[PDB]
Symmetry: C3
């Protein structure tokens, strides 16, 4: 297993090496801040390199993806699935937020915050939106420009751009290809930077252990964060998905668990939603009787854009980092977290080697320090194996629901 997938093993070896070095080097003496900064510099370089690519990645990905929307996607069978795919995911994100505001791991007015959010969804300058944001200062009130990339405004403008360009048809073919090419270029860059990741991440972990000032309380926070992520996973899956299934399909939601149990076990084992497709097909279309015309569209697309466990993960983890730094997010950034987690959930599986840039996207969207992200990587190998399970269960329930919202249409189209 040391030759296949030589990126997870390298990252875990880097994490272990950084932890050992931090433990052995904080034992010597109070370490000078300058040499601590020198030690942690490679991690800062890595995160600067990763943040350098967020804007081109967003611009390329939104334009490329929104140009691939087809009205011939098996008729309504597509759109219904989409209405499912963006629904549950959003709920998951919101649920995660609630839990991270209830468990509280890691111990301006509201109207003005919401007005600033609405203003930021509609920026006045597109070039200024790339590196600045707006806020209401007070002494009458006035509006002042703060530093920080306007993620939501750019995302909204380019969503509108992609929607308007997809309606041009074949006339705008030279541009859809253009951005298309750009996508691979930036994706190639993301492949190279993540190869330097094992050497950088370790350094950051060392920089987090040398100057933590307390080892017994940070390990309690990193345990409570795992506890709330796990609790969110069970709540979302076990309660909501059968409940959403029963209020629409109106059949027994436990026979569905009985039918897709092998797919759940395979997802737990392999920890990959794409490699579970052969098992989940044989489960859905043989054990439950779902028509082949539904699964062959729902499952391959849900395995790429229906990541409802990653959304909850990313909604919990951003507010956890904010709580560790003492930042109390107002109501204008809770919505930003809930939206950016939903957007990043879709791009986490569509973009290869994108599990560390999607968190940076949220952190920069809400303006949080990005040096506490090192601790998140140290515990990802304990959580992904059952984030994948929740993703697979969400795909299976969507496939079971679309067969109940399109049974009559298939029956009529057969005859």
């Amino acid at each position: 297993k040391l030759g296949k997938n030589l990126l997870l093993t390298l990252t875990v070896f880097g994490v272990i090496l950084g932890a050992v070095c931090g433990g052995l080097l904080r034992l010597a003496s109070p370490i000078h801040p300058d040499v601590v900064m020198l030690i942690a510099f490679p991690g800062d370089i890595l995160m600067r390199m990763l943040k350098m690519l967020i804007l081109p990645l967003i611009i390329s990905s939104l334009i490329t993806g929104l140009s691939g929307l087809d009205a011939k996607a098996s008729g309504r069978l597509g759109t219904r699935a989409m209405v499912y795919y963006m629904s549950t995911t959003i709920i998951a994100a919101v649920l995660g937020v609630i839990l991270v505001l209830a468990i509280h791991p890691g111990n301006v007015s509201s109207l003005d915050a919401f007005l600033d959010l609405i203003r930021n969804l509609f920026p006045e300058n597109l070039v200024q939106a790339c590196f600045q944001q707006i806020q209401t200062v007070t002494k009458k009130k006035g509006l002042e420009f703060k530093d920080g990339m306007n993620v939501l405004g750019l995302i909204g403008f380019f969503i509108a751009f992609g929607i308007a360009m997809g309606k041009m048809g074949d006339q705008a073919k030279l541009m859809v290809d253009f951005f298309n090419i750009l996508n691979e270029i930036v994706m190639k860059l993301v492949i190279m930077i993540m190869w330097y990741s094992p050497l950088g991440i370790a350094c950051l972990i060392c920089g987090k252990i040398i100057a933590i000032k307390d080892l017994e309380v940070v390990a309690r926070q990193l345990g409570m964060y795992m506890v709330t992520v796990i609790i969110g996973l069970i709540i979302h899956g076990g309660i909501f998905l059968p409940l959403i299934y029963f209020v629409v399909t109106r059949k027994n939601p436990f026979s569905f668990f009985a039918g897709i149990f092998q797919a759940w076990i395979t997802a737990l084992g392999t920890a990959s939603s794409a490699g579970t497709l052969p098992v989940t097909f044989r489960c859905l279309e043989e054990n439950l009787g779902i028509d082949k015309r539904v699964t062959r569209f729902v499952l391959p697309v849900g395995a790429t854009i229906n990541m409802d466990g990653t959304a909850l993960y990313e909604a919990v983890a951003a507010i956890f980092i904010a709580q560790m730094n003492g930042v109390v997010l107002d109501g204008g950034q809770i919505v930003t977290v809930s939206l950016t987690a939903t957007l990043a959930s879709v791009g986490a599986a569509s973009i290869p080697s994108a599990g560390l840039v999607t968190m940076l996207l949220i952190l920069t969207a809400v303006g949080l320090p990005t040096e506490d992200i090192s601790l998140l990587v140290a515990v990802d190998w304990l959580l992904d194996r059952m984030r994948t399970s929740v993703n697979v269960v969400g795909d299976s329930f969507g496939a079971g629901i679309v067969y109940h919202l399109s049974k009559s249409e298939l029956d009529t189209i057969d005859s």
Copy 2:
């Protein structure tokens, strides 16, 4: 008339509804500023959305238009017309400025202002020109960057870009198409935003009536502004156009009025310069004897780029808004108004549903608040019907002049 052109009726209904709501709601009690801002927020959103599109609109339009210049446009018959089209329009703009500085509706050195203007025509950074400008502060002097998009520098650079790219020929065909596509995209956006305009504009009008602090003096300013716009229209048309005609063509300029009177009446009635073309053709080439080789080029292009009433309108209206806000423009912004009005006059008819973004372009070029633009929309339906008349008369005089600067050339090319 409630089904055809369901944008002007919607806007006038919104204006009336906003006026009624503002009158009935200022009668109740002194309204809290926070709820006034909440009421006017949709208009702010609308103007943010409209200002978001100015830079891409300029970049696309200049490149697309300047690439369509052909040297085979009936030989000199084209260029002479162009020399006319950009001449009178400029004069109109300048005349408007003079009048708005003489009637005065709505009661740093000059050398440094002109030097700052010349510096802004040649920016040092293209990305910084999109959101910043330069100015001379004083205590030796020094140069400091102020906020505000540099419209003139971007316009000049992209004029040079389009001129240089049009000389490449067929080699630069992949790029002219590229920007070409972009044009429709942004134009499509301008079509959507102006559908939300009826709901937004009304709100702004309400926000202008609730907190105006005086109703008897603002209605006097809005009357004097109409008076000066009307006076400018009669001066420009009646005095200048026959006078410019007589010093070149050297024939009677009143027989020309006698010949094109039906076209003037049709322009007054229909209030559209494009729909008057069938009448103005039958007037020019049948009542006055203009050769068909001149009119068939002059009229269709003059109906799109020779808008000499809109230039005077936009030059008067920007300085009127500046005077309402107490801003006294120096000599460096009078030239900016005179230039941006000329540029926006051409783009007002070329870009559909662009009569509210062209004024925002001038306001942001000279850095003026854009909440007083709501009052301009309330009186546009009283002025456009005779702005169109001036535009049609200017087209007709240009067609009558080009036939006197190209009579011998046509006579020789016939034999």
Copy 3:
């Protein structure tokens, strides 16, 4: 000679006229600062126009050049030459720096400066890199954004972009052409602006003579700068090139001078490295016995990218301008000078009429005033005639070395 090459004669006439006007006008009375600024304004306009094009020039040139790298460039015969071409040039630049820090014409910590340099090679925002840079202020330390274009970060990002896009192959053909077209456009602009150069440069020279406050000491600095440039040229060529030749080729490096003496004389006379190619071919492949398979690749490419005299010139001249202004560059800007001189050396011969924008690139890279560049132009005609000689000698030694690193390969490929 007044009809052929009517750009150098125009520039020298402008320099002489400006010098005469400055001498005759400083004799009258102490000249008012406002009229001095008015006199020097055309030069400021010229340099604003030249700086407006640096970013698009860099973006187009890096992408276009890095997409033309072929692995079929005579096998290794290409890459070895490249390893030579970028080696000696770099050495030259470094040597120049040493000399300008030793002769000293024109009489934060180091760790933090190097950390800021490394941070600037990896910017966090691409749009912000176009007009801003980062630095470590002190009261704990903190990082603050300063004004000034981030040349190194943009150059590194677009080098990575071009390398990644060149590996896509034929798939990314629509984009390589796109930027390709852009190149000519911006190059055309550089051709037009340099036609206005003779009128602008003169004004700046006048502005440098009216308010110099001392004529006897500035002429001593302009003499010592020429002395150090000359000393650098002889050191680099005469010492290093034979020495680099002897430690690799291991033959007599003076017989090589004896063989290429005619090419050196022709380069001194014509002062053009491209026009010396017919003489240097007949020297290398007839007097020294170099195989035709080596010279026909080494010489045409070395005449365009192996400009090792221009690199030393530009490394000396930037620090000379910094020393004239009293600026003491730290260790983070010495490296920036050494890198930007190497990058600008390649682009000085690849881009026509680019000898005044390449110096502006370095000056803006290290953030220096660009009004002392006028004095550099007044003495360029005394130095270029033997910068070209050093360039030709460097090309010849590279051709003589590649024939010693590829003799066996050619012998085997012959049979």
